Design a protein around this nucleic acid. Sequence first.
DNA 1: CGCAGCCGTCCAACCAACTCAATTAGAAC
DNA 2: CTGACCTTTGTTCTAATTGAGTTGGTTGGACGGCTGCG
Lengths: 1089, 266
Amino acid sequence: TGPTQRHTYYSECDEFRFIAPRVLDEDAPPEKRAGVHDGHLKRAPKVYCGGDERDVLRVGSGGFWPRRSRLWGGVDHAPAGFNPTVTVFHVYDILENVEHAYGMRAAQFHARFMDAITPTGTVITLLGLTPEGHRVAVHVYGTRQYFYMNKEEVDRHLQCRAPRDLCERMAAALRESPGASFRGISADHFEAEVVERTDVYYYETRPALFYRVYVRSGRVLSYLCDNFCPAIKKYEGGVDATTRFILDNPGFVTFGWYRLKPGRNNTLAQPRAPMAFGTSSDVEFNCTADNLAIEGGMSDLPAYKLMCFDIECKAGGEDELAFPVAGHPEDLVIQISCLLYDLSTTALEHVLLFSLGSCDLPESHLNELAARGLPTPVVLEFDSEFEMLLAFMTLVKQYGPEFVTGYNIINFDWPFLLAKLTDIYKVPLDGYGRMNGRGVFRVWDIGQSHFQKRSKIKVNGMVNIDMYGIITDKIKLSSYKLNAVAEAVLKDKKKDLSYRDIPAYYAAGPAQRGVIGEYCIQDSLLVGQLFFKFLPHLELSAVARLAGINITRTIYDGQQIRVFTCLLRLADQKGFILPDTQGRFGRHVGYQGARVLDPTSGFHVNPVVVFDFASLYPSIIQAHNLCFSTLSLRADAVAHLEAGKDYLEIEVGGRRLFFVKAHVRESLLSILLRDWLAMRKQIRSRIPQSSPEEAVLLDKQQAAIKVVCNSVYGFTGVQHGLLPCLHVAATVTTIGREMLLATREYVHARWAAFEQLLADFPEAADMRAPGPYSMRIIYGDTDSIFVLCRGLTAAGLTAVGDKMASHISRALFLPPIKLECEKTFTKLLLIAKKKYIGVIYGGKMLIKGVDLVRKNNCAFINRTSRALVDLLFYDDTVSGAAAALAERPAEEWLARPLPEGLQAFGAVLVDAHRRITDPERDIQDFVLTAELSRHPRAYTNKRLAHLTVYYKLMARRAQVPSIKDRIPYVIVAQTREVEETVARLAAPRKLLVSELAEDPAYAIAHGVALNTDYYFSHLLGAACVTFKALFGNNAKITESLLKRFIPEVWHPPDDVAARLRTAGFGAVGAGATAEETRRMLHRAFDTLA
Amino acid sequence: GAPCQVVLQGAELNGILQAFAPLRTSLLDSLLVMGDRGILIHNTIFGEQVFLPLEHSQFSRYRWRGPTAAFLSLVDQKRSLLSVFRANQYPDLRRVELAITGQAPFRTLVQRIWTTTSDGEAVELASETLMKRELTSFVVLVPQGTPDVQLRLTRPQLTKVLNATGADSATPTTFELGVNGKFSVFTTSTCVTFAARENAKTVYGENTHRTFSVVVDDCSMRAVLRRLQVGGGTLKFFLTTPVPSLCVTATGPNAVSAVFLLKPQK
DNA sequence: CGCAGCCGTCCAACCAACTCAATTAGAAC
DNA sequence: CTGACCTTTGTTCTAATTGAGTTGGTTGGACGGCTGCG
Ligand SMILES: Nc1ncnc2c1ncn2[C@H]1C[C@H](O)[C@@H](COP(=O)(O)OP(=O)(O)OP(=O)(O)O)O1
Ligand SMILES: [Mg+2]
Ligand SMILES: [Mg+2]
């Protein structure tokens, strides 16, 4: 008989495709060592470990890896009489599935559950762990999806006369579908009720009658939304059953502690019998929502297990040094590292190496691991690729890690594995997650899709966190290779192994395969350290709780769904419904954004105070009660209210809009924001008591929550989004623009004279510096102004600034709007809009927008630019000389030597011009980078350096970059072989920059020379754009003056000399003594004339 | 102050301009070289060497100090210090001055310009002041020794000798001075002759005793000699070297000169 | 006095430099 | 009495790079006019 539903993972296997490298036959002839065996073999898959040997798929006593699994196939392996009491459990994940009563006949389910899935129903499975470490699944019965349609409309269109009629007309529509995939659907599969609700979109909208239609399947709901009566507007048809479960049971959460309890008539949750289990769990329960409640007190995580894994591959074709491609049978996975951690404790518990072929780890690696008190590695040895991959999947099923991590596992590792398991071997993956079959196990690349922000993985009960994703969001680097990240974040240098090196190590015998093993283990250990520094699961679960969505959606599914779910929570409890209006789907902007003030470019050596609004756009939404529900586009809507007292009237984009005030109706967006603003405060509250490392981590968490608050504004601005309203978005930016200008005009009126300031702040008297007093706005962007405060001292302006900010705020705006005094500069270089460099009153340097802090540029030019900046700001002779340049019009410096103090500034450039030519130059200092922002086909301009390097890599069969990867390149010198190459492939031509781009590894290997002219002109370019501000923003003058620092030199060409020497001895200058110089010039004039 | 000074007052200025007017934005990009003896200007035109020796005689005040100095004529690689001497670049120019300052490499040159504005007075063309720094190192290759023979081609017969030259790169051309002094320049296609003496046939000559014939592979010779508005000029030959050359200089007290590499065809 | 050659002026051709637009990266908000 | 899959915060700004078009300047060649010589 066996289990109620079939397990689809492998529990027995008698025959398989055997593929393995011939170089593992240690006693084979030299002629037989190449390539791979590939044929079928009839035996059970085997694993070797420490001289012992076992079948891969056998469960029993002497296993080689840990297990947390109760059932295997149909057999139960729990001790006799195993039966734990469950009261409290922690849920980390939620599934949605459909159960059919006929499929469940033989399971001994109580009647209450059978009624909920007759003839079919959706079941919601909570996945979790008890505090004793038992894996639990709770199956929740009785949740139904539903949507709304306007009753008058439906009545008119279909001629319905009772709710039962609409159910009959829906059943008809389903039956007559092409593909006929809804056989058996009847009116009783639907329930329709008349209710009163209101559409959420404008203030004057009256409540009306809607049919609410309950549907027992999401597949059915999808079809009805798309295809049934398309003229009729539908509401909330896109909401999933999980969301319905979470929102209809107030207080329930997608991540956290629950307890089981008696229900509505003293019903209790039913334990499932093991042959009725749906998942790999210790205990399973059937219940309804009445049997669940949240446990407020419990907050710590239980003993979840984290797996960190990495794979290594070997190409097996004719070119050993091609990058491996998973679709080729001979390009094999050779090793898998797998580290198992307890997330409750941070402790590493197991270190497993899977290895095709024998593998002896070097004694030094074992001693190192022992010294750090880490578990001794268990090495698992396999004869063929299949046996190793099956074993790894067997571990994943039997151990069931709730969290899985790695580095670049979503773009490389999982795709490579799953390709092999699907295409080479024909293994079904739907049973390898938590469910025993019919579950999701997929990767989505970005591919040709115009929409997708990122690649994704979903495995039905398993949270995948790629640390490559996490790191790119938290640290700014030009490269995100793991050695660069390890250097930058963990502060240690890993040695590294290139894919070019692996094929020669592999062929050498067991010891060298051991060296590969060490590299895999070390890589996985680094990724573990990164994981436990950033602790991403805690940040993600906090957001998941607040948004009302599961943690996997919290990782992969964007900002809009977070906002939408929050809005849905509030809408429901106020009587509003949300229109779907998304039946389909330009390149330009939808509305006017922020005002940036024209900067007074220059070098400023008087103090500058920066004022910035805290949480500007959220505060505007809150202060002025902005919402869908509070908006009107008509004056007759607000005719019965009082102007100014009850509503804001505002011109926005040439329309007169109206927003009702909060005592007339509260904004749903205003309420939504409260939780997220609170969450951000709670993080920032902890910064001053935290360590210097904790403080940096907390600052980044803080900033991620700010992104959610701003995405509430953004949500309204999305054309073709889930619930657009460009009127709201444009209002927010309009009000912001007004506030910025108002703040400037206030400061220019109130404190024009020192008298006025001293009248407002008596402490001003101690702050008076010697020259004339002035306070003037020299710059400002969106929500901040820069006030140049000549005549006052920096020491006091910090304190006075707080008071000024308070004063302005209380004079001009409505709470929660708060202007704050952010910082004071002692020196400032305003370069352009969004580009400035300055020093804060403590001594700290701040840099915004300039190439010195953009990730595209090379290390040589960055380090030189930083040196020039340091001289302007921290060398008194240079700062003084820079301030002197402003006394003359810029072009006057063309006809006069510069102030002498700029000596050291010029000296830095001459040194750079020297060092750039040295043969001992480190090519890595010259590496440029750009992101591959999109699929290479979607580019219009195709002459790009990174695209040039992209196609070269593809044609050389190197590792091809993924979309959204940064691509490194160098610019090479055009030796004639380049002209030959590019002309040959395409069809005195000076090649473009994009045609000289090259891969750094190739350029090293083939000794290719760097383009010194490009790099030095690009270095002067960088200096020029950064120091134009000292010369009136004139780039041409800046360029000219900067060139006057450089040593010019002139010579005849070599063959020109080889000729001229024959007749006419050019001893002019270098090449002869000053005596011979004057002699030869005399010698020459008197014959040339 | 200003250890080196070079000056062109109006009395001497026209001595330069009379030599420089035939030059039409042709010499504007050049190297300068300076010592006690005056200025040498040098440039390559169509891949062959051109020189203008401006002797310190041609100047109203002059002083040199320290080692020789060298400067490129362009400033910002756009404007040029030689501009003053071009045509009517400026309608009037009462005087011009070069001053050189500082020490060793890194000496600073300024060129200063003054113009009559009627009113009995002259004023600085201040906006046109040019400042240039000595180049730190240089190699320049310059000619030497007494020429082997000279012919004095007045403008008409210069033009005839010049028009008889070939073109492209394939076609041959040769200069000749055979016995009896025929100066029979020719190609396989075209021929001319002029009566060398140490009526209108004659070319006045020096050291014509030595007789020779020699081909030239150099293209664009005539192109260069037109770019330069060569208002007639002496030809003088250098033949003792393993590669020979022919130097053409305009007829006058001071002159642009261009040096053309001949073939070592004996 | 007539014809031929040389010189001067004007117009066209060719080459280089500068400007403008659009795409892209990547930041600041 | 049985099947499923597209996604998803906003606008403003500078700078590099590439490609096309426009403008200006200079040089070369042709034709006409004037002067000199036969
Ligand atoms: N990522 C973003 N998406 C959308 N709007 C943004 C984003 N960043 C900034 N803005 C807009 C809305 C912000 O309210 C406004 C000003 O931003 P900014 O001052 O950086 O933050 P903030 O004022 O919202 O928070 P705080 O000032 O406390 O950091 O610019
Ligand atoms: Mg890897
Ligand atoms: Mg702000």
